Every structure is written in structure tokens, then in C-alpha cells.
Amino acid sequence: AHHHHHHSKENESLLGITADKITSFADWYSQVIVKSEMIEYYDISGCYILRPWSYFIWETIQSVFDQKIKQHDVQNAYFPIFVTQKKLETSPEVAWVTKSSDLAEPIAIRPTSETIMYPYFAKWIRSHRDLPLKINQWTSIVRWEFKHPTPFIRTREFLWQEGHTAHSTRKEALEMVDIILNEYASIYEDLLATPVVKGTKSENEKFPGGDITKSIEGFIPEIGRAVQAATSHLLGQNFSKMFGVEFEDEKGNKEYAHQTSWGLTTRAIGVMIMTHGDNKGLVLPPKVAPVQVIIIPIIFKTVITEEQKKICNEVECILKKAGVRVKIDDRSNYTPGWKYNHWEVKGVCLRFEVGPRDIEKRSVRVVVRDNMEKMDIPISELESKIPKLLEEFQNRLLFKAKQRQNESIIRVDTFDKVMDTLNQKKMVIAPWCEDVSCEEEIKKETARLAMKSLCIPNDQIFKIEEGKTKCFFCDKLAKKFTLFGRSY
Ligand SMILES: Nc1ncnc2c1ncn2[C@@H]1O[C@H](COP(=O)(O)O)[C@@H](O)[C@H]1O
Ligand code: PRO
Ligand SMILES: [Zn+2]
Numbered sequence: 399a400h401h402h403h404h405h406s407k408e409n410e411s412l413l414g415i416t417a418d419k420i421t422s423f424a425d426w427y428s429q430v431i432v433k434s435e436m437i438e439y440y441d442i443s444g445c446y447i448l449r450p451w452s453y454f455i456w457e458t459i460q461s462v463f464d465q466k467i468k469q470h471d472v473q474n475a476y477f478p479i480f481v482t483q484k485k486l487e488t489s490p491e492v493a494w495v496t497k498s499s500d501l502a503e504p505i506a507i508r509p510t511s512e513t514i515m516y517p518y519f520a521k522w523i524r525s526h527r528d529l530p531l532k533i534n535q536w537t538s539i540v541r542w543e544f545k546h547p548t549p550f551i552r553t554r555e556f557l558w559q560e561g562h563t564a565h566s567t568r569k570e571a572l573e574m575v576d577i578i579l580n581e582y583a584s585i586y587e588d589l590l591a592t593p594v595v596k597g598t599k600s601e602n603e604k605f606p607g608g609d610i611t612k613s614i615e616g617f618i619p620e621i622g623r624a625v626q627a628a629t630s631h632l633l634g635q636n637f638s639k640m641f642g643v644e645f646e647d648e649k650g651n652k653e654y655a656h657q658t659s660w661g662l663t664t665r666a667i668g669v670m671i672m673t674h675g676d677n678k679g680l681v682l683p684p685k686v687a688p689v690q691v692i693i694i695p696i697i698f699k700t701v702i703t704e705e706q707k708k709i710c711n712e713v714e715c716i717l718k719k720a721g722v723r724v725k726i727d728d729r730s731n732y733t734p735g736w737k738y739n740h741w742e743v744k745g746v747c748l749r750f751e752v753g754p755r756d757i758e759k760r761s762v763r764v765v766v767r768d769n770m771e772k773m774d775i776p777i778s779e780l781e782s783k784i785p786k787l788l789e790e791f792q793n794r795l796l797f798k799a800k801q802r803q804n805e806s807i808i809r810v811d812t813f814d815k816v817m818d819t820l821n822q823k824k825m826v827i828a829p830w831c832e833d834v835s836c837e838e839e840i841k842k843e844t845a846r847l848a849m850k851s852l853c854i855p856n857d858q859i860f861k862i863e864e865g866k867t868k869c870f871f872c873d874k875l876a877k878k879f880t881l882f883g884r885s886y
Contacts, residue, residue: 400620403770407735408736408738408739409678409739411739413736415677416429418677419676420620430679434451434744437449437550443547445554445555456664458686472561475534476537477515482506483504487513491509508537509541510560511560512607516640516641519643523564524645534560534561539558548668549668550665553664556663557664558661559662562659563658565656565657568635570656571634575612579613579660586669587796590686591685593616593803595616595803595855596614596856596857597854597881599612602838603837604631605659608631610631612630615627618672619805621672623883623885624884627665628661628662630658631658631659633659637657680743680745683791683792684747685792688744689744691723691784692725692746692748693724694727694752696753701730713777716780717780720780720781721785746767748765748767748787748791751763762777766791807824809828809860810828820883827879829867829879830878831874837850849884854880855881862876
């Protein structure tokens with residue numbers, strides 16, 4: 399459903415998008431991220447260059463989320479990129495530095511900072527008055543993935559954020575986990591306009607050395623594969639016992655700290671691209687669009703007139719004062735049709751066509767990117783209407799994407815109707831016993847004919863009769879309903 403709106407002659411050219419999003423997804427995703435000047439392929443597999451058009455989106459995610467964790471008294475720090483083998487162990491996806499002259503003991507590039515920070519958490523934490531401790535850092539992470547890499551979704555090097563907190567009680571640590579999860583869900587929905595499902599991971603899908611793991615799950619209806627959006631781990635007293643992170647509570651006894659760890663990576667950018675894009679190229683939500691309004695004065699070869707420069711400057715002046723990020727494309731090198739497709743490929747929310755008739759009426763022609771809505775707005779109303787249009791743009795993207803996610807979830811009660819649903823490129827919600835043994839047989843049978851538990855949704859829309867309702871696989875007392883499907 400990415401081919402409904404009108405295409406121009408420039409959109410059907412090579413400077414547009416050639417592949418269809420549904421029938422040829424991988425080629426579509428490559429053309430969208432490359433022709434929009436977001437990604438540049440690197441001579442090292444799995445690594446990609448974040449060009450200014452895409453790095454702007456990551457900077458906005460930084461500004462919003464960093465300001466949210468500071469509301470909860472989370473402080474930023476920085477830990478070394480290297481780690482020793484003895485510390486890293488109390489494996490195949492860890493890059494090892496062995497030479498500089500070889501090294502007697504090779505050092506490793508951090509896949510995560512648990513083994514780096516917690517040896518010093520045990521040093522910094524001695525009393526209950528020293529808790530809670532909340533540390534975060536914005537850094538890059540290297541993980542040599544064995545599967546075929548995908549830009550943003552699965553890269554060997556990616557930018558991320560990792561928060562690590564320590565608490566005096568499990569209760570305080572758990573409500574810290576829910577806070578970061580709701581902020582993670584707020585990033586995808588309130589900022590990226592991408593719908594995600596808040597839930598709890600299964601025992602077989604949770605963080606390895608953790609206690610409880612909660613996450614948000616994203617899904618791509620076109621490819622029919624799920625994508626894990628972000629994770630928030632309740633580590634409990636597991637890691638504190640390994641590194642000796644114990645505090646002295648009131649009453650004098652010794653107790654191991656209750657820790658949490660949570661991360662969000664540049665995978666969020668890719669899930670957004672695949673959620674909103676169409677056959678013209680990028681479709682960006684206005685809250686992360688590098689340019690929300692592009693002003694295209696009708697001019698070819700000849701220089702821009704003094705009246706066109708006067709109109710385009712005051713329109714830019716009104717939008718700049720109104721908080722809208724706007725640029726003027728007065729390049730006489732390309733035709734107006736060329737500029738339309740150019741800024742549509744890179745997902746500019748609105749374009750302003752400024753012709754001689756628009757200067758006479760003191761209005762501008764506005765064309766909306768996602769739905770090709772056309773309208774005349776007087777200049778006297780730009781300060782008010784254009785912020786509203788960008789608000790309507792953001793709301794429309796989230797609404798249309800959310801009704802595609804609900805459309806991609808099918809309720810199943812018996813394993814006989816499970817396979818037919820998955821090939822429809824849809825997820826499965828089913829009653830499940832949440833046992834590790836049951837999940838191991840589900841992934842084996844689904845692969846022979848593989849789907850895994852995506853998350854146990856926090857919001858249970860379907861009721862389970864106590865004692866009677868049985869698992870959708872084999873036979874056991876089902877606890878509640880769990881979301882399944884194949885991943886990316
Ligand atoms: N190669 C990768 N590129 C981008 N993000 C990743 C990559 N590998 C893992 N992540 C994300 O990093 C977090 C780590 O969680 P996990 O996948 O359980 O290790 C999750 O939010 C993943 O989606
Ligand atoms: O690797 C992970 O998934 C967790 C979350 C960030 C820190 N460690
Ligand atoms: Zn079962």
C-alpha cells in the first residue's frame with residue numbers, strides 16, 4: 399500500500415526510486431537510504447557511513463532521550479572502549495585488538511559495558527546512602543554479527559546509549575525499568591511515529607545474565623518480520639554478586655545491589671524508515687525531519703528575481719521564527735520537477751511552490767509529502783497553519799502505522815492455524831505456558847515447516863479462563879497471551 403498516490407515524470411526516472419517497496423524490499427531500502435543521502439556504503443562489511451541527513455535524526459533522538467533521563471537524575475559519563483579478557487569473562491561477536499608489535503594479552507572492543515563499569519560500581523558503592531547510582535553514556539559499540547548485515551537494523555558498528563543503575567531495593571530497580579521502557583516507547587511513537595508493543599521477554603529470550611527483561615517490539619508488515627526496538631533489563635542481584643557490588647543497608651547487614659541496564663541503538667532509525675516510506679523515497683515524521691519545509695521558487699536557468707527573493711526570504715523568516723526548520727532551493731541548475739523529486743526522495747514534509755501568481759496573491763502553494771495534499775495558504779497565516787500542518791503530519795503517520803500494526807496481529811488458539819498465518823506476513827498472539835521447553839519445540843516445528851516469542855504484552859486484550867484455557871502448543875496450563883513471529 400505504498401503506490402496509491404500520484405507519481406511525476408521525475409519520480410519515474412532513475413533519480414527516483416526504482417524498486418517497489420513490497421515486491422522488492424531489500425532493493426527499495428537500499429535506494430531509499432542512498433539516494434536520499436543518508437547512508438554511504440563502506441569498504442568494510444557491516445559498517446556504514448551516517449551522512450548528515452541521517453545523523454540529524456540520531457541527534458534529535460539524543461536530545462529528546464538525554465533530556466528525559468536527566469528528569470530521573472541520570473548522569474552521563476564515559477568508560478573506556480577497551481576491556482581485558484579476565485574482566486570480560488565473569489564470545490564470537492567480539493572484535494579483538496591483538497597488535498599495535500603483537501600484544502601479550504589481546505584486549506577487546508566493548509560489545510557492552512557491564513564488565514567495564516560494574517568492577518568500579520563495587521568500588522563506588524559501599525553504603526545505602528550512596529544509592530541510587532544512575533550512569534549513562536553515549537558511545538559506539540562493535541559487534542561482529544555473523545548474519546548478513548542490514549543498514550541501521552543490523553550493523554557491525556552502531557551508535558547507542560546505555561544506562562546502568564543500582565538501587566537498594568528490587569522494587570525501586572523494577573520501577574526504574576518501567577520508566578526507561580515507557581521513554582523508549584515514547585521515542586518510537588511520540589518522536590519517530592513508529593508503533594511498538596511494550597511487553598516482557600520470555601525466560602529463553604531475556605538478557606542472559608539478567609533477571610527480568612522488558613522490551614518494545616516493532617514489526618515490518620511488508621517483509622513480514624519482527625524487529626526488536628529496545629530493551630530494559632532488570633538485572634536484580636545477579637551482576638552485583640559477580641562483581642561484589644554490595645552495600646550496607648540500614649540495620650547494618652550487607653546486601654547485594656539491585657541493578658538495571660537499558661539500551662537504545664540506531665536501529666530505531668531503520669525501523670522508522672521502513673514504517674513510513676513509500677515508492678517515492680523517504681517519508682520522515684516532522685519531529686525528526688532535517689528539513690520540514692523546502693521553498694522551491696519557480697525558476698529555470700535564469701537568476702531568481704528580486705520579488706522571488708523577497709517573498710522566499712520573508713516566508714523563511716516567518717518559519718524560522720515559528721520554530722520550523724526551512725531551507726530555500728534557489729538553484730537554477732535543475733528544473734522545478736527535478737527539485738520536487740529530489741526533496742521528496744529525502745522526505746521533506748512540505749514543499750512551497752512559489753510562482754508569479756503566488757507573489758501576486760501574497761500566498762504560497764503547499765504540497766504535502768505523504769498524501770500529495772495541495773492547498774493555498776496566505777502568507778499572513780503561515781505562522782499558525784504550518785505548525786498545525788506539521789502536527790497533523792505527525793499524527794497521520796502514527797495513526798496509519800498503528801492501524802497497520804493491529805492489522806498484522808492475528809489471534810490463534812491452535813498450532814494447526816499457526817503456519818498459515820505466518821506466511822501471510824503477520825504476527826501471532828496466542829495463549830502460551832511461557833515454558834522454555836515449549837518455546838524450544840515451537841522454534842523447531844515452525845522452522846521445519848522459525849518463529850519465537852517476541853514479547854509477553856503488558857496489555858492483555860484477550861481473557862484466559864482460569865483452569866480451562868490451554869496452550870496453543872502441546873498441552874499445558876496457559877498463563878496468558880504471548881506475541882510470536884519471525885524476526886529480522
Ligand atoms: N547490529 C546491530 N545494529 C543495530 N542495533 C543492534 C544490533 N545488534 C543489537 N542491536 C540492538 O541493541 C540492543 C541489544 O539487545 P540484544 O539484541 O538483546 O543484545 C537491542 O535494542 C537491539 O535491537
Ligand atoms: O546489551 C544490552 O542489551 C544491555 C542494555 C544496554 C547495556 N546492556
Ligand atoms: Zn506450552
